[PDB]
Design a protein around this ligand. Structure first.
Ligand SMILES: O=c1[nH]ccc2cc(-c3ccccc3CO)ccc12
Length: 279
């Protein structure tokens, strides 16, 4: 590989995002003119907080991902106080940003971007990995407007430690501290609802209220909801995780990709296709 890089190799700029144990900063590599999104983590804070297992697992999962619908790790290096991860810069930002600005997607865009997410999850789960915190803030759009899914600190590599954003948490989490590939499919059913309705399916004044509706399966479809989308969503937001379309007990991604909502989809070269214009 090329020699290890250093902070001094980069012109740092704009902060792209702030996590709890990391900041992501836009950097341009001097020698190449390339722009990376560099995730910076301070060792003391990680060690103090007992996150070494999470930082490690993050780097490790990201090293194993070789697929266009995922953020790529290009390099890592380290000074005395900090860790740096050279990641793909997603030029167009969060999917949630677009949900906000156009309110919700028409059927073509829902179907295109839903399909990409399904195809991303098929690959991920193929390698025995659970994202565990899938959501519109985690799904970035590169400058071609294809998705790039990020944020793998909280991911789990198959062979129950209490993660998740409230809106997208699956029942089994609230019930057994359990998580499986189907937890991600739950999140999918939530994200789909949100693409169409323009809003997460379970919403309440606070986390506890949210968790209540979730385990009760307490949410409703607006009348304008595309029927074939609604139908698919109903086969994902199933309290029983062994009966969610797309999971191993349901015989996997074949039946999920076969679902009528995806009738017009060509799964085979999704990232070669030209994304429908939003809105
Ligand atoms: O461009 C990026 N590449 C890889 C990761 C990444 C991550 C973020 C981020 C970071 C922290 C909190 C929220 C967010 C979401 O905005 C932004 C841009 C990128």
């Amino acid at each position: 590989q090329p020699r290890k890089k250093r902070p001094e190799d980069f012109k740092f700029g704009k902060i792209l995002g702030e996590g709890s144990f990391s900041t992501v900063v836009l950097a341009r590599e001097l020698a190449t003119s390339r722009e990376y999104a560099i995730k910076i983590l301070e060792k003391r804070h990680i060690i103090k907080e007992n996150k070494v297992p999470y930082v490690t697992r993050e780097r490790d999962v990201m090293s194993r991902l070789d697929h266009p619908f995922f953020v790529k790790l290009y390099f890592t290096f380290q000074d005395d106080e900090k860790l740096y991860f050279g990641l793909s810069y997603a030029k167009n930002g969060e999917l949630l940003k677009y949900i906000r600005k156009i309110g919700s997607f028409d059927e073509t865009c829902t179907r295109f971007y839903t399909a990409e997410i399904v195809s991303a999850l098929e690959y991920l789960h193929g390698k025995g990995i659970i994202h565990r915190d899938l959501k519109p803030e985690n799904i970035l759009l590169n400058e071609d407007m294809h998705i790039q899914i990020t944020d793998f600190g909280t991911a789990k590599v198959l062979s129950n430690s209490f993660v998740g954003t409230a809106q997208y948490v699956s029942p089994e989490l609230l019930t057994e501290k359990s998580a499986c590939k189907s937890s991600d499919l739950w999140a999918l059913g939530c994200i789909i609802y949100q693409l169409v309705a323009g809003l997460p399916p379970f919403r309440a004044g606070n986390e506890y209220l949210i968790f209540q509706k979730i385990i009760k399966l307490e949410y409703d479809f607006p009348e304008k909801f595309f029927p074939k989308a609604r139908d698919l969503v109903e086969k994902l937001l199933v309290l029983d995780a062994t009966k969610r379309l797309g999971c191993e007990e349901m015989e996997g991604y074949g039946p999920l990709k076969a679902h009528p909502f995806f009738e017009s989809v060509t799964w085979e070269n999704l990232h070669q296709q030209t994304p429908p214009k939003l809105t």
